[PDB]
Each structure stands twice: as structure tokens, then as C-alpha cells.
Ligand binder design. Structure first.
Ligand SMILES: CC(=O)O[C@H]1C(=O)[C@@]2(C)[C@H]([C@H](OC(=O)c3ccccc3)[C@]3(O)C[C@H](OC(=O)[C@H](O)[C@@H](NC(=O)c4ccccc4)c4ccccc4)C(C)=C1C3(C)C)[C@]1(OC(C)=O)CO[C@@H]1C[C@@H]2O
Ligand SMILES: CC(=O)O[C@H]1C(=O)[C@@]2(C)[C@H]([C@H](OC(=O)c3ccccc3)[C@]3(O)C[C@H](OC(=O)[C@H](O)[C@@H](NC(=O)c4ccccc4)c4ccccc4)C(C)=C1C3(C)C)[C@]1(OC(C)=O)CO[C@@H]1C[C@@H]2O
Ligand SMILES: Nc1nc2c(ncn2[C@@H]2O[C@H](COP(=O)(O)OP(=O)(O)OP(=O)(O)O)[C@@H](O)[C@H]2O)c(=O)[nH]1
Ligand SMILES: Nc1nc2c(ncn2[C@@H]2O[C@H](COP(=O)(O)OP(=O)(O)OP(=O)(O)O)[C@@H](O)[C@H]2O)c(=O)[nH]1
Ligand SMILES: Nc1nc2c(ncn2[C@@H]2O[C@H](COP(=O)(O)OP(=O)(O)O)[C@@H](O)[C@H]2O)c(=O)[nH]1
Ligand SMILES: Nc1nc2c(ncn2[C@@H]2O[C@H](COP(=O)(O)OP(=O)(O)O)[C@@H](O)[C@H]2O)c(=O)[nH]1
Ligand SMILES: [Mg+2]
Ligand SMILES: [Mg+2]
Lengths: 426, 428, 428, 426
């Protein structure tokens, strides 16, 4: 039950930097590799995430991908870089330059061949692959461009493994590039088609969490990605660890998706709390559900009170009663059934993991799949049309070899995607 | 004189965890196997170590891992501890075919070896959930194969039935529709158990406001042991399980007995206590003590069997029966008149250290065939149809090679299942 | 009352390493030779030192060097320790002629001297691999010569048969084709042993995921000792090896018995254990416990002999036989009805310090003639033909003077060998 | 079971300089001769490689051949020179000068007579000769020219002994002489005909190992030849030492060659690892097989994924299980049987030597014989034709007495050689 983690692009590498830190702490693994934890859990399920080398060394089953060493170099240079083997630093020079066409279509493909060779080498060492996880930004040339190439080729090799990816949704407040939503559309066109599931991450919403609910002052990407990693680990650690309602991801996905083409997720983390609150807030499952249900804790700028939920996953960590959980789950559906899909009478899936989080007594994560997600796609299409009409910057991509009808096709597919949510929205 | 218990799926194994604990309780069986002195569930070695005759199947190692790292791991042998690797994904198709088919040969052989190791195989009992993959699908696979090989042995199933309101998986109604049919087809008896009813009992009768499956299964196991452990042990009116088949099922397609348990008393409650046979059996006819959320009131009754432990006298039992006849509100079918089998085991009812039930001096369970069960299936039926109308989630099985008609077919089989109660209740 | 064991080739000697260890185990024989108190395998001197009656042949010093620098080197005498210098190069031609012919005179004389030193020579048993040079070719040479001189003594061979899938030398199928023929011609019995089957047993029954030849040979030796050591020692039903020849081979060209061993239990497994005669003999008929990768199922059975150690009673054995008759799936030939010889040695089964098998109280092996063996030869046959079609590697033998027709001839002899099973299985 | 080692030419002497160093360390023999090791192995099988002189002295059973003292003088002058007896320094003055004709045909032949006299004297002292090993460069006048004379005369004297030679394949990046591939062709013509086996060594590939896989910076010939010697010793030490699947070389060769004229080898060493990796890499047989199978660890510029393997030898050093080895061996053939010959169902030969390497826990070497080898021969023939057409530099050889038809014949034989691989390539 191994999981392959591929980090790609400036952000994928940066996000994954926090993710692996978290995981290492979760299992009591020293930055230089050795395990010093004290629970059976910490040892026994390393498996998934680390290769045990002699000497008690554990190496992350992951590859860091980019066309510039920069980001990866800073990681290697600093803390936790030492846990990574040289073989996980696959990069060229020069980068794409935020160009999807160069990443996917030209230049990074060349690197991708070596990336996948390494992946293959890891898949040979794997005992039992459960699946793959990619971390990247939707609008990024290497993250998404190269990432989408990797996805299409990995699924080719392994149709039956879980293909998942976590992606950053371009935020209205932070464009980089003019064609950031262009890159996103191009990737979406492939991402939808080639993955089993993808997570929607909106920085702007994450900032909202940071300050509005956590009242923190200055979010860095590391703090924001810390938040993200909490949910990523929330998801998979319970896959790893024993529990009561184990929800393998695959199973989950099964349950999450009623329709093959709608595989977008809305994660949210529950025990979000400011420090002040610590002294005032009781922690119960209903408390966690209050924070799960509340749209303000969503990690993406989509309002679940606007859209309708297809599926809701409710991840629990810690020794909760089944009654308490089940009753509260039910209570949520009793209250606002109107925001759920009509044809499924129980749209919320519990998944309780016995194992407590470190530190917290209880923890929970919300994962959903709602029609509200279409709003972000609409934002993309909106911008795209402006851009497309005047081919702004397109010449750069044209030089790479992209056709206007190719982009049009991608747009169409975006339009389809939005209509698909409309079909079940109502 | 022996029987084998099979635990498939998480729920099956978690109940099994309680079951072997209980059998250790019943005789004071040490982890090493010491136990003097009962070989219906255990087989003895020359070391003096007795081991259970049971099979645990989980297609992910995780649950069995807990068994192999838990107490009693000395009592269990790897032979019984079946682990797969990879997952059946909540779908009957893989559970029954794609994945299960790979492991089932191992499993079947292990069963066959144990069967060969038994002397006087009465049959077997299987614990599972109706809604899962493995629990259902794999189970289904297994039951078909067991019906081929062990044709004339008892086939008892203990199936957990999803609460209409609480569900943890969206395709549970889809899986259960496939399951049910096949189950019926090969089973001799299937018990339905509804987690919500049991939760209600835990909070209302046991007064426990924080039940987990571990304590819920303690209840179930206690009941089950009273049903089976006890029946092979000697009593005042020693009844066997094959006798229950004969005396439980009036119809060829009989068969879905409902059990209740009624002395389900909190420690505190038990101080005051005095529950006579009559009092206990009154509690057995309360909806609150049903074990399945159904309501006896509106169904008809066909067989009603009462299973006794401890301090019981036949005369008083008969008086309690007369009380039941008097108190009727028991819409018995005209097909059968009076058909209420009693079995009485002298052995006192047991209590588990770790449980929360007070020691009772006498204990009675009630087995019953009623038409009210169909209501539970109707709830499911509508859920099934809704999903199938959209064909939601179907691709998870179609990619696995399932045919749409197969699912619609299975629903039609469910209709026939509902018709079984219609038929029976209908005619008189 | 005596017999001689000959170990030719690396494999032969490595098995021998286990064999003399085992005989020391059987009586508590000290390195110096103390041993009181069994002279079937050892001969005694007036010093009180008993030495094995065995011959080790290796044409490269290296293996014997390990013997002379190992434990037990006090027990072995240089007479028995035959070393050459130079190599037979993986080819029958040199093994049989070019090189072997130079050393064989020494070897034969040493055998002859030991034969003269025996009193009551029953015969001899030779351990070798089918595929090598020396192991095959030299062996072949030797067997011809021994059939000339010791015409009426027993000629048992224990031949390791290359696993169809794992091979360490490309000309193994070429060498084995030459070998086989001649072996048959002079042998009374040849055992085939398939390393892959044994590996499977080690990991599945013994649960050892890192087998080496040293532990694989421990298994083999244990079996062999139960076959022979034991047969000369006294029991309940004391059977001899010459009796097995009489009772093992129905056909003049008989003869390729298959042995299985079935109590092959890990220490842990053995805790739980209880393997009765019936249980053990069921295990003997499992493909998993075969020692050769073949599958009993599709062959026919002709002789089946059961060899017992320790805690065995004839009546119960007979009951186990009845069980076997019942359980049949044993396609016995119509030529023979019921021909299942049992031999029972009171002496308990032994365990080697250093082994990984649990102490068992009773042990049973099964010897059998089956037609399924031909399948193994068919695999080889195709490999042979492929090589010969290209004439690949042939020059290594042609330069040595071999004729092409000799190799094609030898294949035709193999066809006749396959025909032996065809004949037998065919007719009824 | 003695082995005679003849080093010839600038490189043979230089390579052998590292080889004997390695061997001396392997057996705990001091540079001045005496043995100070501590294992039975170190003592008992010296035999093969050293003559024991009184006083605990061991002398390498080898001869250093050249027509200039230069290289040999530097060896004698420096470390380990003291282990060699004066009798092993057979040289004249002047050299050939990179001229095969002068080496083979004229001038070095005169020296060769004295070389072989010394060889004979050694063969008289030998107890049991197993065979001979020559180290040289294919395109070298004294290495190969004189070397080929030595080979033809030794085989004449000893047809039944193993004649092997290790030779350097001219690399595209390093020509010296214009007629370097000419010399190679001329030698090949004789080498094929007069040897039982030869190893293909391509410097360019060795550099690739050095940096690409080992990430070392500045390869010297000594570092590169260190690598080579690791494989040479890998091969023969197990011949010497006890093991489980002893694979005498002769036996091996038997198994390696299906056809009398194709006796070229493709060695590769397995535990190739950078220092960094040390802290991250687990060492298992599958790990070793991953590095054996991977074409990037081949010591010659031939791609085994292009050609087809006739035979693969798998040398193992250390206490491995037979299962682990056999299963993994099988696994390789299961995966890529398509790169193996059709008519042999088991094309990989294991050879496991019980004895561990010093230091490493496990070690392995790949030896193969594949059709991919023809690529180097093609490079030779390619160059040759250019050269031959315009007799460039040929006049130098013409002066020595070489005929154009003689070279043509050699070419033809090269063409034959290539066609022979084609015949089994498919
Ligand atoms: C004294 C004490 O109890 O301190 C708590 C604490 O004060 C609070 C505020 C923690 C704190 O988290 C944050 O302030 C935070 C900072 C950036 C982004 C997101 C969150 C805490 O830092 C985080 C830390 O979380 C963990 O230890 C979990 O195991 C968590 N670990 C990490 O995120 C992690 C951080 C650094 C290095 C390695 C891992 C985790 C969660 C899900 C899955 C895997 C791991 C906890 C409980 C605390 C501190 C230390 C103050 C809270 O967060 C989490 C994820 O638990 C914020 O609201 C919760 C409520 C906690 O009570
Ligand atoms: C602390 C420690 O464990 O150090 C190791 C080491 O770090 C590594 C990197 C060694 C090291 O080898 C090299 O760096 C190297 C340099 C030039 C050319 C080729 C290799 C090592 O130098 C080489 C040395 O090898 C041996 O000792 C073998 O017996 C080897 N000996 C020689 O090559 C040799 C070197 C100098 C003088 C005399 C002999 C050998 C291999 C096959 C057959 C016979 C002998 C070893 C294990 C190491 C060091 C010392 C760092 C490695 O190589 C070998 C041949 O083992 C390179 O990848 C392996 C993996 C080893 O772990
Ligand atoms: N009484 C009781 N019900 C349980 C227990 N565990 C699970 N259930 C119920 O059984 C159903 C869950 O089945 P799952 O655990 O999802 O699946 P499974 O049947 O084990 O098989 P898979 O789907 O392949 O994992 C739900 O309706 C649960 O409410 C338990 O320990 N006790
Ligand atoms: N069971 C078992 N099989 C072995 C052992 N050693 C080798 N074999 C098998 O026997 C065959 C090997 O024969 P070799 O060792 O190559 O050769 P040999 O028969 O000793 O004689 P030569 O070829 O002349 O060396 C292969 O099929 C091996 O798998 C051993 O110790 N035990
Ligand atoms: N959450 C999050 N978003 C990031 C990070 N880095 C870049 N992004 C987002 O990613 C988009 C830019 O794409 P980028 O990652 O630079 O593309 P690439 O590097 O060329 O593949 C913007 O919407 C950013 O907000 C990060 O570390 N965390
Ligand atoms: N690996 C390797 N190649 C060498 C060495 N010395 C020369 N060579 C190669 O040998 C070829 C030159 O032949 P050379 O040895 O000078 O010939 P000779 O000295 O006249 O016999 C070139 O292809 C070199 O790369 C060495 O020490 N190691
Ligand atoms: Mg489960
Ligand atoms: Mg040998």
C-alpha cells in the first residue's frame, strides 16, 4: 500500500516541503532519517511513505520535479533536505517559464522521461502500490504542464492505481501571469480526463482561514501550505493507520463520485482554531461538525450553500463514539438537506479513524464534492475568453506550437465541465 | 458435535473479537489455551491448548493485524487469520469476483481443512455486514462455494443491516441489493442486525451514551452465544440448532429470524431487579428491545422461539407463555398455531468483564419470523431504485464488468423477497 | 547389514554434509567417533571410532576442502574424500570420459575397498544432480562401472532435477538428456528432486523466506534418513529397502519414485499441532508437499508407500488408509489394486539442532510412482530440442568428441522414457 | 589452478597496476610481499595469483610487457612496484610507436620471443594452469599488436587452457592515432580467431559511470581502471574462492557461448554507487539486479536494450539466499524476455559466491554477451573504410610490410563478425 508522491513546480515543491515535514513528525522520523518515535503506528505504517534503508533510514517515496533547481535547492539546503535522496531531485535548466506549452509540450517532456524512469524504478521497488499523488498548481507550466504529462503517462502505465492530484486554483487576487488561467484550462482539459480525483485549493480562501478564523497575521506560503498539509495528512493518514471506518481513498472515491467526470474536491479542516479560542472552546464532535459545515473553513473559494453537495466526507481522528459521530452526522443532514443531492439519501460519509492526532484530541476533515466548484471554473472561463479573443500572449504559446482550436477544444471541455455540474445542480 | 464460525469483513471480525472473548469467558480459557473442561468451538491439541474453530477473512491486512497484535493471539493460528492485500473497494464486483476470487481458494481450503478436522460438523455460522464489499460480496462468493461443498450442513448467517438513517457509504444500498439475493439463495438462516436499534438499546436500556462498535458487538456476541454456545451445552430443555432450523422455518424460503434479547440491564438498574421469566419475556416483545429497527406491531408472527439461561422452571415458563398469549397484541398467523419453541439451558447467563451489563440470574432471547422485516427491505428498495435511476455509481461496477440488467434483476429478486412476506402474511 | 552412500558433485556432497550430520544426530555421534550403540552406515574401529561408509567425489578440490576444514573432519578419512584438480567443465563428455575417466579408477577402487570392508552389503545410494557434468556425467560413468561389479546390489539414486524455471546453466538440459538415459539403464531407483518445490515448501510450510541450499538439503536429508536410516533400524513394521525395490517397482523399467514428506512444520506452527496419522497423510497427497514440481492430479498412481516414524499404531494407520481411499482423488491404475505398502519405525522422528522444524511426534513420508513425472521430462525435451535445433553449445561436446547422433539418440531414449509413463498410464 | 596475467602496452600495464593492487589488498599482501591478512581465504587461494617465496613472499604470476620501460618504470618506482620481480619487466627500446605492424609483425616480435620464454618458465613452475589473461587496448601496437602475437603463440602451446583477454575498445572521443581503428581491426582479426573470450571495455562508458552514476569529478585512468579491476576481480575471485555456484570461468564460458566465434563480453558492476547514495540506498539482491540490468552501468558503449542477450552472467559475492537470488534472476527474465535470445529459455546464469567482498556486504557483476556489441564493431568498420580508401597513414604500415589485401581480409572478417551477431540478432 504504497503511495507515490510527486511534487512539481514552484509550489508543488514548496507545498510538499511542508507535507513531508508533517509526515516525518507524524512518524517520529528524524530529519536525517532515522526513526525515533515510540508508537507502533509510527513504525508499522511507515511503509506507505518511506523506504527503509539499512540503518534505520527512511526515505520518502517521492520525487521532486522542476525545470529549475532553485526551489528544490533551498529545500535541500535547509531542514529536512537531508531526508531526501539525490535521486529525488530531478531537474533541468532552464525553465519553462511559466509556459505550459513548454512544460508539457516541449521542454519539460524531455525531463519527464527521466522523471518517469525514476518513478518506474520506484514502482519496481514497491511492494504494493495503492496510488499516486501529485502536488501542483493548476496554472503552472511545470507544475501542471509537466505534471499533466506525468499524469497521462503514469495512468497509462498504471490504469488501476489511484491517480490523484492536489491542485492550486488560480486566485483572483494573485495572478502571475497573464495566461495563468490559460494554463489552468489547458491542464484542466487533461486533468479531468486523466485523473481519478483532484483537490481544489484556493489561496485566497486559505488566507481567509489564516486570518479570519485563525487570526494569524502574516501568512506565508509555508504557513498556508502547513494548513494544506494538515488536510492532506488528514486524508491519508487514516488510510495508513488502523481505524474503524477505514476509508481507503479508493473506496472513498468510489463513494464520492456518482459520475465519472466529476472528480473535484473541496477539503476543509475542522479543528481550526485560533489560539485564543483554545481557552474557551470545548472540543466535541458537534463542535468539529460546526466547523466542518461552516463554509468559512473551506479551502477553496466556493460556497457550499450556493451549490449542492454530491458527497461529503467526514474524516475523524481519535476515540469518538460511533453514536456521537453518527448522530451528529445525521443531524447535519437533517438540518440542511437542501444543500445536498436529491437522489442520494445519505450524502455524507463517515470515516472514522481510531487513531488520534498528535496533540489534538480530536480532529476532522471535510471533503466534499459540490456543484459550487463550478464557480471557480467559471472564473477561469471568463478570463480565458478575454484572453483568447485578443490572443494576448498566445504568440508565446504559438511559438511553442499551440493551436487556437486546441485551446478552443480545451475551452469547450471546460464548458462541458461546468455544464456537468449544472446537470446535477439542478 | 462441532461447528465453525466464520467472520468476514470488518464487522464480522469485530464481532468475532467479542465472540472469542466470550467463549473464553464461558469456560475460563487462558490465552495459552488452557481449558479444562467443550469442544464445540474449540479443538484440542495435545499440548493442552485449545484453539477456536473459526475463520477470519479480511482482504486488507489491517483488521487481522489487530488480531495478531492483540490479546488472544496465542489462541489464534495463522491458518485462521486470512489477510489479503488489496482491497475490494466497497464493491460487490470485486468482492465477489475480481479480488475475492483470488483469495477465496485459500479461504475455502482452510475451511475445508478445518471441516476435516471436525468431528461431527453441525455446520457453520457467518458474521458479516450486508452492505459492504467483502462483507457482502466476498461473503456471497464464499456461501455459494460452501453450499456446493457442504451441502447438508447448517448455514447460519448473521448480517448487519444498515440503518435506514445512518450510512457510511453511498453504494451500500447498491451492494446490499446484490448481496441479499444470493444470501437467501444459499442460506438457511439470516439474522439481520440494525446498528441504530442497538444504539438505542445501549442508551436506553444500558444507559450508555457513548457506544462504540466494540460495545455494540459485546451485546451482539452475548446474544449470539446464548443462542449457540448454550445450545450445545446442556440444559433443561436441550435444543439444537438443527432443531431450530426445523423449528424455525416454515417456508422454504424462509428465513430471516429476528432475535431480541431482554435482559439488557445496566448495572445500576440492576439493582433493582427482578426480572422473572414473565417480565423478561414481556420485554422481549417490546419494540425497544428488538435489535432491528422494525416494529413488531404491524407484522404477523410466525414462529417465536424462546431461549433461556439460568434460573428457569418449565412451569413458570409455560405461565409466561400464557401471559404472552393473553397480552397479545401479537398478530400471529393462522397458519401456525402455536408454535412457540422453548429451549432452556441450565447454564447461567454470563457476563463479560468489561461489559456494562449487570449479572442476571436468568436470561431469555426471542427468535421470530415476522413480516415486518419487509419494511426494512422496502426502505432499501427505494434507495436502490433512486440510485439506479441516475445510474449513479454504477460505473464502479460496470468497469468491473457488471451488467445493468444484473442490478435490475437483483432488485427484482428483492421484490420477490418482499413478496415472501406478502405471501405469508397475506394468506391465512 | 550395511550400505554405502555416495555423494557426487557439489549437490551430492552438500547433501552429504547434511547426511552425516543427521547420522550423528541419529545416534549422538561425536566428532571423534564415539558412538555407542548401528552399523549400517558406520564401521567401527578398535579405537572406538566409528566412521561413515560413504564416498565423496568432487573433481575440483574446493568442496571437499570445505569438508576437510569443517566439522566432522575427524570422522572422515581421506580415502572417502576424493578430490580431483581439474574440472569437468559442466559437460558430460568430460565428466564421463575425458576427466572422469582419469579419476574413476581411484574412485572405483575406493568403493571396492569399502565394499570389501562391508559385511552384508545391501547396496548403495548415490546423491547427484541431473544436470551437471560431474554430477551427471561422472556419476553416469560410475554407475555403469558399479553395475558391472556389484551386480546384484541395490542401486538407489537421488537426483536433483532442475527446476523448469530456474537454471544456472544453459547446457543443463543438454547434460541431463545424456544422463537420464544412462541412469535409467543402470539404476534400480531414481529419486527426482525439484529445488523450486522445495523452496516453496520452505517458505510456505516452514515459513522461511531465505532458504539456502544448506537448509534445503537439511530437509532432503531428513527425509532421506527417514527413508533409509530408519528402515534399517527396528520398528513396528520393519521393512527393508530391498523390500521396497520389490514393492516399489512394478515394471522393469520402473522406476522413478516420488517422495513427499509431510510433517514439514515450522516451530511456530507447531504449536499447534496436532497432526495425526490421518492428517499427515492428507498433507502427503497435497501438491504443495511434493518435493518435485509436478501435480499429482493428473497422473495415475501405481505404488504408494508410507514410511512412518514415532507414535504410530497400525489400526489407526489402516483407518488413515481408508480415509485416503475415501478421499480419492487419486487416480490409481487398474493394474494394481491396492498396493500401498506401509513401513513403521518405532524410532521417533528427529530434529536437527540448527534446523527450523519443530519436533514432531510422528512422521510420515510417501513414496509414489506416478505418470505425472513425464511432464517434467517433456519440459526438458522441448528445451533440448530447441538447443539442438540451433546446435548451440554443441561444440563444447563435439570438440570433445561427441557425435551429433549421440545427442539425438539420447533424446530418443528420453522419448522412450516418456513412453514408459504413457504405457503405464495408458493401459489398465 | 593458476592464472597467468599478462599486461601489455601503455594501458595494459596501467590497468594491471590497479588490478594487482586490488588483488593484493584482497589477500592481505603487503606491497613488499609478505602476507599479513587474517582469513583462510586470503591465504589458501593465493595460489592462483601468487608464487610463495621463502620468507613469506608472494610474487604476482604476471608479466609486464612493453617496448618502452616508461610506464613500467613508473610502476616500479612507485607503490606496489616492489612486489614485482625484475623478471616481470620485459621491455625493449624503442617502441613501436603505436604501430601494430611493428609490434606484431616486426619489432615487438623479437621481444615476444623473450616474453614467452619467461612465460614458459612460469608455466614450468605452475602446478596446474587454469588459463591466461591479457590486458590490453584493441587499437594498440604493443598492447594488441604484440599482445596478439603472444596470444597466437600461447594458444599454440596451450590449446586447452583458457585464453582470455580484456581489451579496450576505441572510443569515439579518444582517438590517438589515426589508425587506431585500423590497429583494432587487425587485432580483431586475430583476436577473434585466437581467443576463447574477450572483454569489451569502452572508456567513454566508463566515464559515464564515473560521473553519471557515481558523480565523480575527475576521472583518471587509474580511477577508471580501478572500476575495471573491480570487475576483473569480481570475476575471478570467485573462481578462486569457495562458493555455491562456482563458476569456473571455463564453465562459464561454456555456458556463455552458443557459437564458437562469438566471444565478446559486456561486463557491468553492480554495486555502483555514489557516496551520497550510501545514506539512502538499501542493498538487496533486487537492488543489485536493478543496477545490473540497467544499461547505464555497462562498461562498454553498447545498449542491451537494442541488442539481444545471448547470455547473462550474474556474479554474486556474499551470503545471499538462493531463493532471493533465483527469484530475482527469474524476475528479470520474466520482465524483459524480449531482450533475450529466443532459443534459450534461461539465458541468465547465476553464480554465486559465498564469499563476501571486503567491505561490501553484497556485490555483483553482470557479464553478458549480446548482439548490441556489434555497434562498436560497426564504428570500427566505418572509420576503417574511410581510412582504407585513402590509405591514410597506411604507408607507414606499408613500410612495415602490410598488404592492402591483408587489411581487406581483416575487414572482411570484421564484416563476418558483425554479420554473425546479425544472424542471432535476429
Ligand atoms: C499546545 C498545543 O496543544 O498546541 C496546539 C495548538 O495550539 C493548535 C492551536 C494548532 C497549531 O497549528 C497552527 O497554529 C497552524 C499553523 C499553520 C497552519 C495551520 C495551523 C499547532 O501549531 C499545530 C499542532 O498540531 C499537531 O501537532 C498535529 O499533529 C498537526 N501537526 C502539524 O501540523 C505539524 C506542525 C509542525 C511540524 C510538523 C507537523 C497535524 C494535523 C493533521 C495531520 C497531521 C499533523 C498543535 C496540536 C498545536 C500547535 C503546535 C501550536 C491548530 O492546528 C492544528 C493543525 O492542529 C490550529 O488550530 C489547531 C488547534 C490546536 O489546539
Ligand atoms: C566506508 C565504506 O564502506 O566505503 C566504501 C564506499 O563508500 C563505496 C562507495 C565504494 C568505494 O569505491 C569507489 O569510490 C570507487 C572509486 C573508483 C572506481 C570505482 C569505485 C571505495 O573506494 C571502495 C571499497 O571497496 C572495497 O573495499 C572492495 O573490496 C573493492 N576494493 C577496491 O576496489 C580496492 C580499492 C582500493 C585499494 C584496493 C582495492 C573490490 C571490489 C571488487 C573486487 C575486489 C575488490 C569500499 C567498499 C568503499 C570505499 C573504500 C570508499 C564503491 O566501489 C566498490 C568497488 O566497492 C563505489 O560504489 C561502491 C559502494 C561502496 O559503499
Ligand atoms: N454492529 C456493527 N455494525 C458494523 C460494524 N462495523 C461496521 N458496521 C456496519 O456495517 C456497514 C459497514 O460495512 P464496511 O465496514 O463499510 O464494509 P465491509 O462490509 O467490512 O466490507 P468492504 O466494503 O469491502 O470494506 C455499515 O452499515 C456499518 O454501520 C461493527 O463493528 N458492528
Ligand atoms: N537441492 C539442491 N540442488 C542443488 C544444490 N547445488 C546445486 N543444485 C542444483 O543442481 C544443479 C547444479 O549443478 P552444478 O552445481 O552446476 O553442477 P554439478 O552437477 O555439481 O557438476 P559440474 O557441472 O561438473 O560442476 C542446478 O540445477 C542447481 O539448482 C544443492 O545443494 N541442493
Ligand atoms: N497555496 C499555494 N499556492 C502557490 C504556491 N506557489 C505558487 N502558488 C500559486 O500557483 C500559481 C502560480 O503557478 P506556479 O506555481 O508559479 O507555476 P509553475 O511554477 O510555472 O508550475 C499562483 O496562483 C499562486 O498563488 C504555494 O507555495 N502555495
Ligand atoms: N581504460 C583505459 N584505456 C586506456 C588506457 N590507456 C590507453 N587507453 C586507451 O587505449 C587506446 C590507445 O592505445 P594504446 O594503449 O596507447 O596502445 P599501445 O600502447 O601502442 O599498445 C585509446 O583508445 C585509449 O583510451 C587506460 O589506462 N585505461
Ligand atoms: Mg472493510
Ligand atoms: Mg561442481
Amino acid at each position: 500500500r504504497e503511495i507515490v508522491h510527486i511534487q512539481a513546480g514552484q509550489c508543488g515543491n514548496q507545498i510538499g516541503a511542508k507535507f513531508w515535514e508533517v509526515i516525518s513528525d507524524e512518524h517520529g522520523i528524524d530529519p536525517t532519517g532515522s526513526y525515533h518515535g515510540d508508537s507502533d503506528l509510527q513504525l508499522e505504517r511507515i511503509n506507505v511513505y518511506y523506504n527503509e534503508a539499512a540503518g534505520n533510514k527512511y526515505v520518502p517515496r517521492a520525487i521532486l520535479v522542476d525545470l529549475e533547481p532553485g526551489t528544490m535547492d533551498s529545500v535541500r539546503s535547509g531542514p529536512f533536505g537531508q531526508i531526501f535522496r539525490p535521486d529525488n531531485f530531478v531537474f533541468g535548466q532552464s525553465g519553462a517559464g511559466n509556459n505550459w506549452a513548454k512544460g508539457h509540450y516541449t521542454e519539460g517532456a524531455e525531463l519527464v522521461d527521466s522523471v518517469l524512469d525514476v518513478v518506474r524504478k520506484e514502482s519496481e521497488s514497491c511492494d504494493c502500490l495503492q496510488g499516486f499523488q501529485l502536488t501542483h498548481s493548476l496554472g503552472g507550466g511545470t507544475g501542471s504542464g509537466m505534471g499533466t504529462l506525468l499524469i497521462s503517462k503514469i495512468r497509462e502505465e498504471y490504469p488501476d492505481r489511484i491517480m490523484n492530484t492536489f491542485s492550486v486554483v488560480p486566485s483572483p487576487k494573485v495572478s502571475d501571469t497573464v495566461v495563468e488561467p490559460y494554463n489552468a484550462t489547458l491542464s484542466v482539459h487533461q486533468l479531468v480526463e486523466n485523473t481519478d480525483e483532484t483537490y481544489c485549493i484556493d489561496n485566497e480562501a486559505l488566507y481567509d482561514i489564516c486570518f479570519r478564523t485563525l487570526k494569524l497575521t502574516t501568512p506565508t506560503y509555508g504557513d498556508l501550505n502547513h494548513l494544506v498539509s494538515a488536510t492532506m495528512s488528514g486524508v491519508t493518514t487514516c488510510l495508513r493507520f488502523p481505524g474503524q471506518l477505514n476509508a481507503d481513498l479508493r473506496k472513498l472515491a468510489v463513494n464520492m463520485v456518482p459520475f465519472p467526470r466529476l472528480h473535484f474536491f473541496m477539503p476543509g479542516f475542522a479543528p481550526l482554531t485560533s489560539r485564543g479560542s483554545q481557552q474557551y472552546r470545548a472540543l466535541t464532535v458537534p463542535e468539529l461538525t460546526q466547523q466542518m459545515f461552516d463554509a468559512k473553513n473551506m479551502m477553496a473559494a466556493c460556497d457550499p450553500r450556493h451549490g449542492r453537495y454530491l458527497t461529503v466526507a467526514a474524516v475523524f481522528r481519535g476515540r469518538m463514539s460511533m453514536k456521537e459521530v453518527d448522530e451528529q452526522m445525521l443531524n447535519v443532514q437533517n438540518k440542511n438537506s437542501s444543500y445536498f443531492v436529491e437522489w442520494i439519501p445519505n450524502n455524507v460519509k463517515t470515516a472514522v479513524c481510531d487513531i488520534p492526532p498528535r496533540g489534538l484530541k480530536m480532529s476532522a476533515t471535510f471533503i466534499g464534492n459540490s456543484t459550487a466548484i463550478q464557480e471557480l471554473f467559471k472564473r477561469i472561463s471568463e478570463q480565458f475568453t478575454a484572453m483568447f479573443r485578443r490572443k494576448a500572449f498566445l504568440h508565446w504559446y504559438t511559438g511553442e506550437g499551440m493551436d487556437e482550436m486546441e485551446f478552443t477544444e480545451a475551452e469547450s471541455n471546460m464548458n462541458d465541465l461546468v455544464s456537468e455540474y449544472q446537470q446535477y445542480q439542478d | 458435535r462441532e461447528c465453525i464460525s466464520i467472520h468476514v469483513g470488518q464487522a464480522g471480525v469485530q464481532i468475532g473479537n467479542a465472540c472469542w472473548e466470550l467463549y473464553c469467558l464461558e469456560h475460563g480459557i487462558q490465552p495459552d489455551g488452557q481449558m479444562p473442561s467443550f469442544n464445540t468451538f474449540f479443538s484440542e491439541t495435545g499440548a493442552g491448548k485449545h484453539v477456536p474453530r473459526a475463520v477470519f477473512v479480511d482482504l486488507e491486512p489491517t483488521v487481522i493485524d489487530e488480531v495478531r497484535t492483540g490479546t488472544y493471539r496465542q489462541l489464534f493460528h495463522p491458518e485462521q487469520l486470512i489477510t489479503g492485500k488489496e482491497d475490494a473497494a466497497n464493491n460487490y464486483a470485486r468482492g465477489h469476483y475480481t479480488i475475492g476470487k483470488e483469495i477465496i481458494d485459500l479461504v475455502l481450503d482452510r475451511i475445508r481443512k478445518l471441516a476435516d478436522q471436525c468431528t461431527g460438523l453441525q455446520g457453520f455460522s457467518v458474521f458479516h455486514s450486508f452492505g459492504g464489499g467483502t462483507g457482502s460480496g466476498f461473503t456471497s462468493l464464499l456461501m455459494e462455494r460452501l453450499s456446493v461443498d457442504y451441502g447438508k450442513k447448517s448455514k447460519l448467517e448473521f448480517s448487519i443491516y444498515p440503518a435506514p438513517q445512518v450510512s457510511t457509504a453511498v453504494v451500500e444500498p447498491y451492494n446490499s441489493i446484490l448481496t441479499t439475493h444470493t444470501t437467501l439463495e444459499h442460506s438457511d438462516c439470516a439474522f439481520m442486525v440494525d446498528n441504530e436499534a442497538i444504539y438505542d438499546i445501549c442508551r436506553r436500556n444500558l444507559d450508555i451514551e457513548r457506544p462504540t462498535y466494540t460495545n455494540l458487538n459485546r451485546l451482539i456476541g452475548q446474544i449470539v452465544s446464548s443462542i449457540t454456545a448454550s445450545l450445545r451445552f446442556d440444559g433443561a430443555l436441550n435444543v439444537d440448532l438443527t432443531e431450530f432450523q426445523t423449528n424455525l422455518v416454515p417456508y422454504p424460503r424462509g428465513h430471516f429470524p429476528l432475535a431480541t434479547y431482554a435482559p439488557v440491564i445496566s448495572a445500576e438498574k440492576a439493582y433493582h431487579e427482578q426480572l422473572s421469566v414473565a417480565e423478561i419475556t414481556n420485554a422481549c416483545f417490546e419494540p425497544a428491545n428488538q435489535m432491528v429497527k422494525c416494529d413488531p406491531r404491524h407484522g404477523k408472527y410466525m414462529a417465536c422461539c424462546l431461549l433461556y439461561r439460568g434460573d428457569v422452571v418449565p412451569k413458570d415458563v409455560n405461565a409466561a407463555i400464557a401471559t404472552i398469549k393473553t397480552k397479545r397484541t401479537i398478530q400471529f398467523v393462522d397458519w401456525c398455531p402455536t408454535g412457540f419453541k422453548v429451549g432452556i439451558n441450565y447454564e447461567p447467563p454470563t457476563v463479560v468483564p468489561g461489559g456494562d451489563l449487570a449479572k442476571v440470574q436468568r436470561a431469555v432471547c426471542m427468535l421470530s419470523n415476522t413480516t415486518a422485516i419487509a419494511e426494512a427491505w422496502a426502505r432499501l428498495d427505494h434507495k436502490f431504485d433512486l440510485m439506479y435511476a441516475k445510474r449513479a455509481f454504477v460505473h464502479w461496477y460496470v468497469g468491473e464488468g457488471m451488467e445493468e440488467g444484473e442490478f435490475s434483476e437483483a432488485r427484482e429478486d428483492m421484490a420477490a423477497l418482499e413478496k415472501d412476506y406478502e405471501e405469508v402474511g397475506v394468506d391465512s
